[PDB]
Amino acid sequence: MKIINARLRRQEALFTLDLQDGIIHRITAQAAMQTADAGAIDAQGRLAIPPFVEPHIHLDATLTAGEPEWNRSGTLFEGITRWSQRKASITPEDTRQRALKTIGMLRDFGVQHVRTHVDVTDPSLAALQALLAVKQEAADLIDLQIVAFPQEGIESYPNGRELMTRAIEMGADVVGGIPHYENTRDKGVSSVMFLMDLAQRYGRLVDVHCDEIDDPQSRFLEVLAEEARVRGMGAQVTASHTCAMGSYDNAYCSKLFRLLKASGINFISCPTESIHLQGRFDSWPKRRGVTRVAELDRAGINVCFAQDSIQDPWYPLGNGNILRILDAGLHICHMLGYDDLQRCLDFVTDNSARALCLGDNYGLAEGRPANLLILDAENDYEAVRRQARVLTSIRHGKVILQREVEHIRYP
Amino acid sequence: MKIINARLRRQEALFTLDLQDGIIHRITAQAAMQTADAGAIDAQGRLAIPPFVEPHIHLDATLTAGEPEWNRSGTLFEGITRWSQRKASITPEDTRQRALKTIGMLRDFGVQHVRTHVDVTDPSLAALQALLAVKQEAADLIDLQIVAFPQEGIESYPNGRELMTRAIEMGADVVGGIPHYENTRDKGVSSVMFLMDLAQRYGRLVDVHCDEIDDPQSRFLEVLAEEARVRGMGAQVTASHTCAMGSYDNAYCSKLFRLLKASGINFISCPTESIHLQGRFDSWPKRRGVTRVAELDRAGINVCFAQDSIQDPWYPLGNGNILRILDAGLHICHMLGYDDLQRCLDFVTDNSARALCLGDNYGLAEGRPANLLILDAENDYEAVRRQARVLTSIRHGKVILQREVEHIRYPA
Ligand SMILES: N[P@]1(=O)C=CNC(=O)N1
Ligand SMILES: N[P@]1(=O)C=CNC(=O)N1
Ligand SMILES: [Fe+2]
Numbered sequence: 001m002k003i004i005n006a007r008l009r010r011q012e013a014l015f016t017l018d019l020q021d022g023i024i025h026r027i028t029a030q031a032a033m034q035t036a037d038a039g040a041i042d043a044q045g046r047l048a049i050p051p052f053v054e055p056h057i058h059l060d061a062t063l064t065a066g067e068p069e070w071n072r073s074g075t076l077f078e079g080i081t082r083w084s085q086r087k088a089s090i091t092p093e094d095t096r097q098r099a100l101k102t103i104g105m106l107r108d109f110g111v112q113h114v115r116t117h118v119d120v121t122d123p124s125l126a127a128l129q130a131l132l133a134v135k136q137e138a139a140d141l142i143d144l145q146i147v148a149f150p151q152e153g154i155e156s157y158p159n160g161r162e163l164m165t166r167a168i169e170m171g172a173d174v175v176g177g178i179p180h181y182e183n184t185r186d187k188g189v190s191s192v193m194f195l196m197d198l199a200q201r202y203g204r205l206v207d208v209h210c211d212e213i214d215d216p217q218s219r220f221l222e223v224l225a226e227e228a229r230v231r232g233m234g235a236q237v238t239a240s241h242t243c244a245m246g247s248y249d250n251a252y253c254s255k256l257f258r259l260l261k262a263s264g265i266n267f268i269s270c271p272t273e274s275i276h277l278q279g280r281f282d283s284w285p286k287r288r289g290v291t292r293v294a295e296l297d298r299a300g301i302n303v304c305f306a307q308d309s310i311q312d313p314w315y316p317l318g319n320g321n322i323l324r325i326l327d328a329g330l331h332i333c334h335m336l337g338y339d340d341l342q343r344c345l346d347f348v349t350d351n352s353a354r355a356l357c358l359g360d361n362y363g364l365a366e367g368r369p370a371n372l373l374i375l376d377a378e379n380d381y382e383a384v385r386r387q388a389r390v391l392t393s394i395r396h397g398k399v400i401l402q403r404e405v406e407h408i409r410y411p
Numbered sequence: 412m413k414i415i416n417a418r419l420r421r422q423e424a425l426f427t428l429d430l431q432d433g434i435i436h437r438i439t440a441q442a443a444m445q446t447a448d449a450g451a452i453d454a455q456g457r458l459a460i461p462p463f464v465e466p467h468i469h470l471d472a473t474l475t476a477g478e479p480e481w482n483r484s485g486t487l488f489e490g491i492t493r494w495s496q497r498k499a500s501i502t503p504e505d506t507r508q509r510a511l512k513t514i515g516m517l518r519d520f521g522v523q524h525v526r527t528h529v530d531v532t533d534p535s536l537a538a539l540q541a542l543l544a545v546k547q548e549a550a551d552l553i554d555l556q557i558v559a560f561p562q563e564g565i566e567s568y569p570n571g572r573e574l575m576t577r578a579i580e581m582g583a584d585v586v587g588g589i590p591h592y593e594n595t596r597d598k599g600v601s602s603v604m605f606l607m608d609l610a611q612r613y614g615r616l617v618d619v620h621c622d623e624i625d626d627p628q629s630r631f632l633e634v635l636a637e638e639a640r641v642r643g644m645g646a647q648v649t650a651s652h653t654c655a656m657g658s659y660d661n662a663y664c665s666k667l668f669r670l671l672k673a674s675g676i677n678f679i680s681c682p683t684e685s686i687h688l689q690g691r692f693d694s695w696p697k698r699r700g701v702t703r704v705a706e707l708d709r710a711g712i713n714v715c716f717a718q719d720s721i722q723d724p725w726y727p728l729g730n731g732n733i734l735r736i737l738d739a740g741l742h743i744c745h746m747l748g749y750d751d752l753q754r755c756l757d758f759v760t761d762n763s764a765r766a767l768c769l770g771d772n773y774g775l776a777e778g779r780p781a782n783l784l785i786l787d788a789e790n791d792y793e794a795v796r797r798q799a800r801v802l803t804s805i806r807h808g809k810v811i812l813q814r815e816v817e818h819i820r821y822p823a
C-alpha cells in the first residue's frame with residue numbers, strides 16, 4: 001500500500017510512503033503533488049504522523065462516573081472514595097466491556113499506543129485479569145501497557161506489598177505507586193524503595209503517580225529520581241503528575257532539576273485532569289496546580305501529556321481525543337510561543353513514545369512498523385489550532401479507520 | 412419550513428418547530444419520533460438551540476499575529492506594544508478582509524451574534540470605519556455590535572476623549588474603556604466617570620475591559636458598578652475580564668458582591684485568553700487569573716464566556732469555535748459538577764444574549780426571529796463533552812449552513 005502526497009513533520013515538501021509486509025518499506029521525496037490515486041492513500045498535502053499515544057489512562061475506572069454517587073467536591077480524595085464504592089462491584093466482564101468501549105474512542109482519535117493503570121488494591125485482582133486479556137484481544141487496535149497501581153496505597157492497604165508482587169508476576173509490565181497517598185511521609189518513602197526494588201528485580205518499567213497534590217512539601221519525586229539514578233533505571237522510569245512541583249519552593253526546585261536531569265526519568269502531565277482536581281484547597285488566588293512542563297522541556301527533560309480519565313470518579317468528561325488535551329496543556333503551562341506551537345505535536349507523539357520506551361517500534365522511518373495517521377492539517381500549528389481530524393489510521397500496514405473530509409454546504 | 416424530532420434544552424420531549432415569514436410560528440411537543448415529509452427537516456432527535464453568541468472579540472486585530480513581531484512574553488502589555496506597531500499600517504480594506512474571514516469562522520461554528528471591540532486610539536479611526544461597514548456587509552450572517560475601545564487609554568492617549576466621542580458620533584453601539592491601563596489610579600477612576608457620562612448621554616451600551624491584570628489592588632470594577640447602579644444603567648453595562656477579582660482579598664470581595672448584585676451589571680470572562688495572558692508575573696505556584704465565574708453565577712449575577720482573540724497580538728490560536736472556550740471555562744473555573752454540566756450551554760447562549768441586550772430578538776419562543784441551530788448532541792452535557800458540531804444553522808428562517816453527520820468507517 002502506498003501513501004502519496006504526504007507532509008512529514010517540520011519539513012516542507014511531499015513524500016510517498018511505501019508500506020509492505022506490515023513495515024515501512026520506502027520513504028521518497030516527490031517532485032510535486034501527484035495525480036489523485038484511488039488505489040493509494042492520497043494525503044493531498046496533509047500531514048502523515050506516527051500514531052497518537054495515550055501514556056496515562058485509567059481503563060479499569062473508565063465509564064463509571066456517578067456510580068453509585070458523584071464526586072461532588074471535584075477532589076482527588078473524594079474521587080478515591082467514590083472509586084472504592086464502585087470497586088466493590090467490579091468484575092472482569094464489567095472491566096472488559098467498559099475498557100473496550102473507551103479503547104474504541106481512543107482508536108477513533110488515532111491512538112494506537114496506550115499505558116493503562118489498573119488498581120491492584122483488590123484481593124481478587126479482577127480488573128487486572130480482564131485488562132491482561134484485553135491487551136491480547138485489542139492488539140488489532142492498540143499496543144497496551146499495564147501499570148500495577150496500588151490506588152489505596154502499598155504500605156497501609158491490607159497485603160499491599162503482596163498484591164503488587166502478585167500483579168507483576170501475573171504480567172503487568174509496569175510498576176506503579178502512590179507515595180503522596182501513603183498514610184505518613186516515612187511510608188511514602190518506604191513505598192518508593194519497595195516499588196523500585198520490585199521493578200529492578202523483574203526488569204520492569206516504572207510509572208508512579210507522584211506528588212499529585214498541591215502541598216509544596218510533597219517531595220517524593222526526589223526519592224524516585226534518585227533511586228532511578230542509583231540503579232541506572234532512568235530511561236525506564238516515569239513520574240506522572242508531579243503537581244506539587246508546580247508549588248515547590250523555587251530554590252529547592254532549582255536544585256532538584258540537577259537530579260531530575262541526571263536521573264534521565266520521564267514526566268507525564270494530565271492538564272485537563274489537574275486543572276479540575278488541583279487548586280481545590282485554595283480560595284483566591286487559585287493555583288493552576290500543573291507541573292512545570294515548559295521548564296522541564298527547556299531543561300532537556302522528556303515530558304508529555306495525557307488524558308488520565310474518561311468519564312470516571314475523578315473526571316466527568318472525556319472523548320478520547322488527545323488533541324483537546326494538548327490544547328489545554330499548552331494554555332495552562334504557558335507554551336503558546338511561536339516555537340512551542342511549531343513543534344507541539346512532540347508532546348502527544350514522540351515524547352510519549354519515549355516515555356513508553358517504544359523505540360524502533362514507533363516512528364516514520366524505513367524498516368519500522370507501518371503504523372501511522374493521516375491528519376487533516378499541514379503542520380503542528382494548524383493541527384492544534386483546528387483540532388485537526390484523523391482522516392486515516394493505518395496499523396500494521398492495514399487501514400483500520402477512515403473518515404471523510406468535512407465539507408460544509410452554504411445554500 | 413418545519414423542523415421535527417428536535418430536542419430542547421433541559422427537556423425530555425421531542426418537539427416540532429414551525430418556522431415562517433422569518434419568525435418562529437409554533438413550538439409543539441410530539442408524542443414520539445415522526446417521519447418527515449417534503450420540505451421538512453428531521454432533527455433526528457438532536458438538540459435545537461438559539462445561535463451561539465460571541466459577546467467579546469477583537470475583529471480589528473484578528474489574523475495579525477506575528478506582524479511585525481511576536482508577543483514573546485505572552486503578556487497583555489507586550490501584546491499592546493505589538494498592536495501599536497501593527498496599527499501603523501492598518502487600513503480600512505485590510506481590516507475589512509480580515510474581519511470578514513474571522514466572521515466566516517464564527518459563522519461556521521454557529522455564532523450569529525457578535526460584539527466586537529475596535530481600537531479607537533487611532534487618529535485615522537480606520538478600523539472603526541471598516542467595521543461600521545462590515546456590520547452592514549455581514550448582516551446576512553451576523554448581528555454585529557461595535558465597541559469604542561480606547562486601547563491606549565482615555566486619559567493617557569492624545570485626544571483620547573475626543574476620539575471616544577467621534578467614535579460614538581459615528582455610531583459605535585457600545586462604549587468601552589480600559590481603567591487598569593490608565594497611567595495613574597486617579598485617571599483610571601476619571602476615565603470611568605467619562606465613559607459612563609458618554610454612554611448615558613448618547614444612550615449607548617457599556618462594555619469595559621475592567622481590571623485585566625493580576626494586581627489585587629486593581630479595583631476599577633467597584634467604580635464601574637457603582638456608576639451603573641447610581642445611573643440605573645445596570646442592564647446596559649458589562650464588565651469584561653475582571654481578572655483581578657480572581658486575586659481579590661476575600662473580605663473585600665464578599666462586600667463587593669453586594670454592590671455587584673445591586674448594580675445589575677453583566678460579566679464576561681475569556682478563559683483561554685486569560686489562562687494565556689494571566690499568571691505571567693508569578694513564579695510558582697502560578698495563579699489561574701480568571702474572574703470568579705462560578706461564584707458570580709451562584710450569586711444570581713449574569714456571567715458568560717468569550718473567545719476574545721483569534722490569531723492576534725495577544726493570542727496565537729483561535730478558530731471561531733465557542734464550544735472549545737466553554738470547555739476551557741468549565742475546567743479553569745471549577746464548574747464540572749453534574750448540575751453545572753446539565754446547564755453549561757447557558758454561558759455561551761442565553762447569558763451572552765442578555766449581556767448584549769438582545770431581548771425578544773433572541774431565544775426559541777413563538778413570535779421571535781427564526782434564528783437557531785441544530786447541534787450534533789442531545790443535551791448540554793454531550794454538547795460540551797463531544798464538542799458537538801453545528802449540523803445546521805438557520806437565520807431569518809433560511810438555512811445558511813449545513814453539515815452532514817460524521818460517519819467513521821472501519822474497513823478492517
Ligand atoms: N487523578 P488520578 O490520576 C485518577 C485516579 N486515581 C488517582 O490517584 N489519581
Ligand atoms: N486580552 P485583550 O482582551 C485584547 C486586546 N486588548 C486588551 O486590552 N485586552
Ligand atoms: Fe492517573
Ligand SMILES: [Fe+2]
Nearest residue numbers: 469528620719
Ligand atoms: Fe478583549
